[model samples]
Target: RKLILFIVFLALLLDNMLLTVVVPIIPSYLYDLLNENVQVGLLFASKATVQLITNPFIGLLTNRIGYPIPIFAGFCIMFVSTIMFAFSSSYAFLLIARSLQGIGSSCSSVAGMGMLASVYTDDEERGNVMGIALGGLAMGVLVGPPFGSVLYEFVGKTAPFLVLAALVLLDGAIQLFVLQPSRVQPESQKGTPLTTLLKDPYILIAAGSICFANMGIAMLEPALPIWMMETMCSRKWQLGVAFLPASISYLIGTNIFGILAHKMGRWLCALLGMIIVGVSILCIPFAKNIYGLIAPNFGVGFAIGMVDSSMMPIMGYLVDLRHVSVYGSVYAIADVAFCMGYAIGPSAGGAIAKAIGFPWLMTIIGIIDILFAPLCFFLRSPPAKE
Candidate 1:
């Protein structure tokens, strides 16, 4: 079970790595290609647009075919998308590639989560396992940008993406040879409508948490590199270097905060994490140089890592509260929240940066995150009996 879970963790890590690998390179690459910041934001947002539409359907797909089918299918699409992403020539190509990447993410993460929960049945330990698994993702954040930066610098843009293609294919082969998909019991015939799920408080709070948390993080995605460029005159390697501190901070938070979250209460973790995130974001504009930005960005990553642990228990609690087979739909709903944040964050952040300047935009976004602090208090922890 440990070995199996480890592989899943690797897959998740790879997914995250691919997702973020382009971050450092994208701003400069797109700037060189077409000096439109909003377009860069759109490149990030287009993926979310597709994700929002496909997530729920992916949820249903997992219940029908089990984890392996969607996971494998997602990898196949990701393979092609990654290849295109490497050599993308136009805005249209970027949109199509990014959108397909989102679809792949919907399939991979939604189903992968369901299958992971199926493996770790005990509620008390589930959060821990999920946290450990999520470490792989944080690790990716730690290494991916720097890796992308170095590869892009020495080898060119195509190098990082070519590596992504290989890794994606490797994950696919693992799915084919090393593991079999978990079987899902069919969903109930008299199905609970998707709208009905929205009425559940558990789903609502989790949804809200995921949405705002992701949005706040994403608010910087399109703006960060450009800001770095303006302030530091950063190169590709330095761009990745700037993110390294934050990534390390994030990894530490994921492990340390995640283990404690079960004891501290998930809601408490959520609130605490967001508070730090808000403060960090608020501090962004105050940083006039690359050195000034590092600590605050690190704070952002750490806080986000702290916030991420809460989702595992929330998902576990839902599994206990509802039918086990509905995990796909459950996660998909969570995906909706996640995607909404991504959808709005970059585009809005870029526009705000353009309109009012980056500092004020971050300040406002930071305040919005701070406002979300109260919403966490509304969440209910898992029943004591569990």
Candidate 2:
């Protein structure tokens, strides 16, 4: 169990690390090739588009096959994409690399989370365990950009990804030895159908909250760096370092709120998170400088952490409560929600920000968040189970 958790953690860490490693550098890297901010948004959205499309199929595959093989396949795909990122020279090449990473991420995230759900059957224990596992994601977010910038500045473009690709290989080998394919069973030959899961309001609410929690950060990824450059005259490394506070707060929030939600109620955690995230988004466009942005960004990350930590475990509980013990379809719903937010946030955010302006974009999203807060009241908790 310990080894399995570590494997899941490492997979998520590497996947998220690769996701953001390019974020800080993307603007400058593509400045010459892109004509508009909307194009940049398109590049960012490409991965999620692929991820969104592939998530359901991956979920079905996990249900049919099992966790270990799917995870291994994901690592193989990620390895190739990481190398592709290292050598990418054209805008189209970059888009393909990012899209490949998206598909790989779908594999890792669903399999990893599904593995945890299968392993940790206790409702009370699930939240805490999932929190620790998700720490890998926050750690990846924390380290990724600086890792990219510091290495990109000191060594070269290829160096960061090459180093990451080596780690990917190492992870794959470690997983093979620790997780025997023959020992692991498929989640269920027959499980809850995707359509039924999607129809449940509790399931849908959990997925919706997950989507909104992620959307704020996804919206900022493409929009913020450019806004910073235009207004604050930010440098590349600073762009990488700027997110540090948010990541740190997020790390803290996940662990704390994971436990807190169990005691205080997951619905309350999500409600508070939505309100805080909305206010934080509203506060962002007002920042006069990078330093001024820290508090609001921190709020966004921490609140997102709260929402994610609570809602994730809720989905698992929902499965056990209303459906079979099978986790693949539900976790897939969670992945699609997250992917949809990421897909829409960047693509829509960029075009809207370009069309109206950054400030207005922030205002609109903030209002939507505030309006959405009431929906959390509908999210019910799992009954006490021995």
Candidate 3:
């Protein structure tokens, strides 16, 4: 159990670290050459676009083939993408590499979470485990940008990615030796289909919450760096460091809310989270300086933690309650939601921020979040089995 949790932690940590490391550096990297926010958005969006498509297939494959192999495969692919990112100069090259990372992540995320659900059968226990594992995600978010910016400033652009590539290999090596998944049961072999799970209203609600939870950070990734440079006259490291409060609060929120969801009811936690996230996004664009940005950034991050911690465990519980205990397919749906939000957030946010301006774009998204918060009430438990 501990081993599986550790593996999931490492996989998610590396995936997110690679994802955000570019956030602080990429705007500047492409700004002079391409000079287009839309292009930057596209590059960021490409990864999630591919991830959205691949998630279902990976989910199915994990159920069929087992966790360790797919996870190892994900590591291999991540290694390749890390090297690609290290050397990429052209926009096209960087775009492909980012997309490739998305594919690799689909494997790690689905299988890693599925493995955990497979092991921890109790709902409360599962929630706790997930919260602990997800800390990797918050930590990665916490570390990635600063890691990238500081290294990019002192060493070179390639250094951060090269370090990640080496870590990927080391993690892959550990995965090979450490992971030994239990054999798939004959009865569990033929599990719930993706389409069947998608038809469930409860599952759909869970997925939507996951998507919204992610959008808070996802929307900011492509738009913020450039806006910060213009508004605050921020440097590269400041752009990276600016996210620290969000990550810190996120780390705290996930662990606390993950446990609290059981007591408070997941629906209420999610509703509260969405409202906070809405308010935070609305406030973000109003910040005149880096210090001024901290409160809203922290709010968005912590609120995301609340929603994700609640929603993720609900994915497993929904499956156990409505379908079979088979988790890979369901978690895949969660990943697809994540990809959808991430894909749309950056691509649309960049274009919209460019066209309408960041403040107005934020206003629109914030209002949407508030409007949607009421829907969480409908996520009540389904009728008891006959």
Candidate 4:
């Protein structure tokens, strides 16, 4: 079990590394090749949009068939997409490649979580395992940008993408051969009715929280570098420094909060995490320097890690273990909402920045994040096992 968990963690870590490492370079790459900021923004948005629409369906398909096939498929797509992105010179080519990459990522993300839920038995154990998985994710976020940026400076833009593609392919090879199929096969094999899953209020609330949280997080991605540049006159590499503390904080919070959830209960831990995240966002705009920015961002990342560690496993607890794929699909649907928000957030931030300013815009976003706390009140405790 430990070995299996480690393998999964390694795979997910690579995925996140690929996702995050490219962010800092996107503007520069677009400027050099396409010479259009609008195209860059559009390409970024298109990726999320594709993920938003496809993730749920991919999850459902994985649930119906099994995890390995979808995992493999996602890897293949990512391998191709990453290579395409590395070579892309035209705006249209970049958009298509990025969209494909999104589809690939969505598949892996949903399937990986579903597989984790399927494999773990105890909720506490699940949280610990999930924490480890997220630890890899945090590490990826921490290391990816600095590594990619240095590679970009020393080597070139195509080098990082090529490396990402190679790493993903290698991971996929391991997953295909070494990871045994352990998920419960649904009794009917016909799959759970989508309507039944959608009708559960508790599930809906869980899903809603996931979506909204993701949206809030996504809003920061495009804006963060630009904000750092404008306010601190920071270089591209400095963006990694802004993210580093948050990444470390996130890993700590995931483990700590996972233990807390096991002791106090998932709902309580989740609520507390949500409240902290709201507070962190509220504090972001008040930040005057890098340390100020890092402090609140770290708080937000910690809170998010806590929420994520609790939420996904609790979904497993909510439904029958046999329906792990269904639960995953439902969760992915909420993720689609997140992707939609992410897709819109950059352009929206840009427009708002142009209209009023980045400071006020961030303040407004912070307020909205804080306002999201009340919605957590609707989330119910998992039903007692009979």
Highest lDDT, which number?
2
Return the TM-score for each candidate structure.
0.87, 0.92, 0.91, 0.85
Q: Model 2: per-residue lDDT, tens digit, 232-300?
A: 244555757777888898888998987899899999999999899999989877777657778988999
Query: Tens-digit lDDT track for model 1 on 181-250?
Result: 5555454443345677776776677777767777656776565544345533535456567567777887
**Candidate with maximal TM-score:** 2
Stretches of candidate 2 off by over 4 Å are 32-36, 182-184, 226-234, 354-356, 381-386
RMSD of each: 3.6, 3.2, 3.2, 4.4
Instruction: Name the runs in model 4 displaced over 4 angstroms.
Output: 32-40, 180-190, 225-234, 288-291, 321-326, 348-364, 374-386
For model 1, the stretches where C-alpha displacement exceeds 4 angstroms are 24-36, 181-192, 225-234, 322-325, 352-358, 380-386
Question: Lowest-scoring 10 consecutive residues by lDDT in candidate 3?
Answer: 28-37
What is the descending lDDT order?
2, 3, 1, 4
Which candidate model has the greater lDDT, 1 or 2? 2
| Location of the lowest summed lDDT over 10 successive residues in candidate 4 | 29-38
Give the C-alpha miss distance for residue 250 in model 4, angstroms: 1.8
Clashing pairs for model 4 are: none
Task: Write model 4 residue lDDT over 165-228, tens digit each, in one string.
Answer: 8888788778767754445444234545667767767777666556555554555655554433
**Cα shift from native, residue 175, model 2 (Å):** 0.8
Clashes of each: 1, 0, 0, 0
Better of 2 and 3 by TM-score: 2
